Amino acid sequence: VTVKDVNQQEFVRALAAFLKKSGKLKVPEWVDTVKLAKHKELAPYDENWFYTRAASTARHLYLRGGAGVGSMTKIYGGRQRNGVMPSHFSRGSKSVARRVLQALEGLKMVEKDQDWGRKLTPQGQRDLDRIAGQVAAAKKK
Amino acid sequence: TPDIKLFGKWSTDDVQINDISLQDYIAVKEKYAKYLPHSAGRYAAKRFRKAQCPIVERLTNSMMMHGRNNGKKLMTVRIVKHAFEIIHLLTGENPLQVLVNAIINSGPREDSTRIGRAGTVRRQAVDVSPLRRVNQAIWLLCTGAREAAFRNIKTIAECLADELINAAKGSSNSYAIKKKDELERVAKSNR
Amino acid sequence: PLQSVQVFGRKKTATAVAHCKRGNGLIKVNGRPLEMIEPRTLQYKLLEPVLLLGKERFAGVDIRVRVKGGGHVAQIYAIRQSISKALVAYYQKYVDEASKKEIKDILIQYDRTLLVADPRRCESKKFGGPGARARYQKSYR
Amino acid sequence: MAVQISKKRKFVADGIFKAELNEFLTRELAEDGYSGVEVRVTPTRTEIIILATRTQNVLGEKGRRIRELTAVVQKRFGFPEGSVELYAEKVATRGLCAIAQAESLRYKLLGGLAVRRACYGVLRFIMESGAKGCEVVVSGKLRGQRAKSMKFVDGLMIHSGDPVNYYVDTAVRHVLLRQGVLGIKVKIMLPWDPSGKIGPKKPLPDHVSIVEPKDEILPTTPISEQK
Amino acid sequence: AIHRIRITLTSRNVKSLEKVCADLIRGAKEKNLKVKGPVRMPTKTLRITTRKTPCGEGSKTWDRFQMRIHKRLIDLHSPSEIVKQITSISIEPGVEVEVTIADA
Amino acid sequence: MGRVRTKTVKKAARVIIEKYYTRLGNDFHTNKRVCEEIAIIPSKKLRNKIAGYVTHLMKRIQRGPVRG
RNA sequence: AACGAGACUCUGGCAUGCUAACUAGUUACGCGACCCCCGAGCGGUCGGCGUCCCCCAACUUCUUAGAGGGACAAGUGGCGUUCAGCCACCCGAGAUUGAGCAAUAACAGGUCUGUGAUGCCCUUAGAUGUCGGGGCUGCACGCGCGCUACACUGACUGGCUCAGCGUGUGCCUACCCUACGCCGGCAGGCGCGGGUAACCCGUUGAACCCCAUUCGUGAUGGGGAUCGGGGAUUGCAAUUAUU
User: Fold this and answer.
1) From what superkingdom does this record's organism come (chain F)?
2) Alpha helices in D44-170 (DSSP H)
3) I need a labelling partner for B150 at 20 to 30 A (CA). Which of A12, A79, C127, F32 fits?
């Protein structure tokens, strides 16, 4: 199936687990000291947040035409509570997303293609739709 | 059922209005049963236009109040789906008949107002419309659950389903059936 | 011979162009199932015409819809308003009057802006208020 | 010689040139019966049509003054040399030219003359020349050191709606004296409704009239007439 | 040769604009230059929202001013000579024109 | 609500019925197009009014005599 | 008879009618390429998913902006002198969508610190006309406009998913909006490229909202005032803390 058919809350939670089994993703050392965005006030509860976020990275590339380190951050950014000052939007971290996308590219599930952005490899696109049916196999769509 | 919507699971058949006075401002099943309570946003541009829209929707509207909850009608519908669910497990009825009793038991029979004489407060007893009774009864019980969950561990859903029980069977443990009888106790005095 | 008729619906600047093209079943929106359009609490609402009229009216068409504009909410009313009219137009053009006149009576009974459109949009603000009607506080001392 | 500025900024800079000129000229041609301008850029040439009632005093003997004015513009806005070309124009019907009528009243007053008789004299001219009506104000001092106002009015006037933009013109001119300043204002109403130039539109302004032709005859009786 | 030559018009007055466009579409179609119609572009709003009172005092008031520009362009493909000949003439109002060598 | 007709309507409505009595129908749309041809009304909204009053008068003129 | 009211101008709401579009789209194939059998079948094909390919294709519903039409108390039932109008209903967009413009006469209202508008008076070389430094932020107190909060209809951490009015370097005298690549926890730095703009930023991949964890009625993880140390950016200069 196409990844469109299935729920997406389910999609990531099986795709994150998939990667961590296969020895995939060489992770940065900083992963236990990282706020993760400028608009947070805390570190994540999750201890495998890197695996989770790489799932959501590869999915969006399937849909849209692909874009760089800047655009990924804009997709993830949220609201910043400035305390006594009124809240405003802001963008999160960059150097994390710059490690994510290069780590994917090491596996050749993405690659720097033309028109100013990484795009997902046919090998990558194969692997997405492969586990997309595994979701329907599991529960029952 | 295939020609008339339920509520997503709850029959609007086997639902009665047990007064002859307050029907034609309580209706829920003539064809006015729908899968969800929502509107396109027509509800009022005439005085008569208010009446037509469902009782279950009216309940959802008057549930979101006091600043932080305004403009969050979807969050509000979450509380109502749990309410009927809790009412059905807890006592076991068509959980709309609970609500219809709860509305009818909370509406006042006589009410007071003000009248100006000698620059001093005097009061006069007067009657009340059926449309007034419905509007008042929907207001009163929704204040109860809002009040209780303001420091309780209990969620508003739990509080609200409790408040419809004690209204549907009068027992004066609700904020509604108390406050109903306060008004009538005044209306006896100055009359 | 190719049969294709298009319609749209609107509510508060949310356009939803729903083409009825000959085929069988399989209504979609944006190349995704209508079963997973995302508030998934208003799921009974966009389904309402299909469920109420039966699925045997939707047995000579493939409908796909493209949308744009509005928020999460107003889009739901737009896609409902379009699919209702889409079905009608298919009967208006290839089948006789008495087929669709029947279908018109059913929908317009529980009219909820299925076959009509609100004329209500935002009013323009004027100075001395944060809203169009609401005004700043006035002090005499 | 490039590139070229944004289209938004293209109109603003034109407006600044249209406006600056229109106040430059008014401080020199005041006595010559100034009445406005109308600019036109044309292929590889500028036209600046310097409208004034008496082209005589504008021209001068051997065209000295027109030569001064062209040399000024050629240096001031940094025009490419020899592109600028001036032209003059005399207006016919001078009592619909509020700007000139107001600035003529100014020199009549500043010449040393009474106010009432001066206001009357200008009034009947702008009424005679054609006009539904007309108005004059003089606000400032006279006969002591507290101010007053003096209105002189005849005919029709409008004050409300969109017709104010078409069917009236209004001018303001300050005039000095040894004691303070006096404000002149002139407001004059344009009369055309039948046709032409066409300048202001044909419908009537304040009460919009129904233009009504008439024909009505019959003498018919049955007959056949072959052609 | 025959070059795709674009006659851009730009104005602020809808009457003055449109009739001058019509003239160029008649004269082109008359000579069978295979002229392509007007492409009307979005009219743009210059807004200025500023005080109505100098030396602010009294009830607080403002004033909305606006200017509406208009753009529209007719694409021709024909020899550049007869275009640049006929274009610059037969224009009465103050309306701008910009000829382009090629765009397509 | 409101929308009580002004004198500018009632003045010309009477005139237009007197001199073009024959042309009138009793339909809105026909009486509109006649007023458009026998006169020019410089607005569109104004035209839609003067027709409607011309229609409303023509109803009563087919009874006893009007005094205006 | 005239001015104001109304009329008028702008804006919203009704067009599968009209006008025409690679600086706007849609549909249709031609497709070839990728993808998964996911469904009939076998993987092909038929169907489904977007992107490149798109034309000398077709069209203008969607988008854009022009010319036009449409609503008038028009029709019906009540009511009114049966006049002027008012109420209900059909059709449907109901006779009020919101703004702009606005009379006579007046005020010792505000503005000489907008004005090379201006009277009179003052001052004018030991200057009320220039550089350097300080101040307009100084607090035992009184008042006004607001912002953020007092939690569970919540906060916190992840996941999903939607928009519009605009604006942008080539300008003032030195300056714009930013994609992409690389480096850093972050602020930020650095290398390249586009945009005179329905063309590039931006198919503006915004918040509340939505979905799943964690906290538990506790001045608590609610609240973020006060305050210590450290790192960056702007500028000629940042101390009384520029950000």
Assistant:
1) Eukaryota
2) 55-59, 64-76, 98-110, 116-128, 163-167
3) A79
**Which CATH code for domain C1-141?**
3.30.230.10
Q: What number of C-beta contacts closer than 8 Å exist between D and F?
A: 26
∠ CA C123-C127-C130, nearest 5°, is: 70
Residues of the domain holding D75: 7-90
CATH 3.40.50.720 describes domain F7-62: no
CATH of the domain at D76: 3.30.300.20
Distance between the alpha carbon (CA) of D131 and the C1' atom of G1, Å: 18
Domain spans in chain C, listed from the N-terminal domain onward: 1-141
User: Which positions in strand G are less than 7 Å from the protein's CB atoms?
Assistant: 2-9, 11-16, 19-23, 26-29, 34-38, 47-52, 61-67, 69-75, 83-87, 93-106, 108-111, 113-114, 117-120, 143-149, 151-154, 156-171, 178-188, 196-198, 202-203, 205-214, 216-218, 223-225
The resolution in Å comes to: 3.0
Sign of the C-alpha dihedral computed for residues B163, B168, B171 and B176 taken in this order: positive
Q: What is the DSSP letter of D31?
A: G
Contact D170, D98 (CB under 8 A): yes
Nearest to F41 among D207, D210, D214 (CB): D210
Phi-psi region of B67 (alpha: psi -120 to 50; beta: other; left: phi over 0): left
State the Cα–Cα distance between residues C138 and C136, nearest whole angstrom.
7
Q: How was this structure determined?
A: cryo-EM
- CB of residue F46 closer than 7 A to nucleic acid strand G? yes
- Determine the distance between D18 (CA) and G169 (C1') in angstroms: 27
Q: What are the domain boundaries of chain A? A: 1-141
Closest by CA to B54, choosing from B78, B35, B74, is B35
Q: Where are the alpha helices (DSSP H) in chain D?
A: 7-24, 55-59, 64-76, 98-110, 116-128, 163-167
A129 touches strand G (CB under 7 A): yes
How many interchain CB pairs under 8 A, B with C? Answer: 33
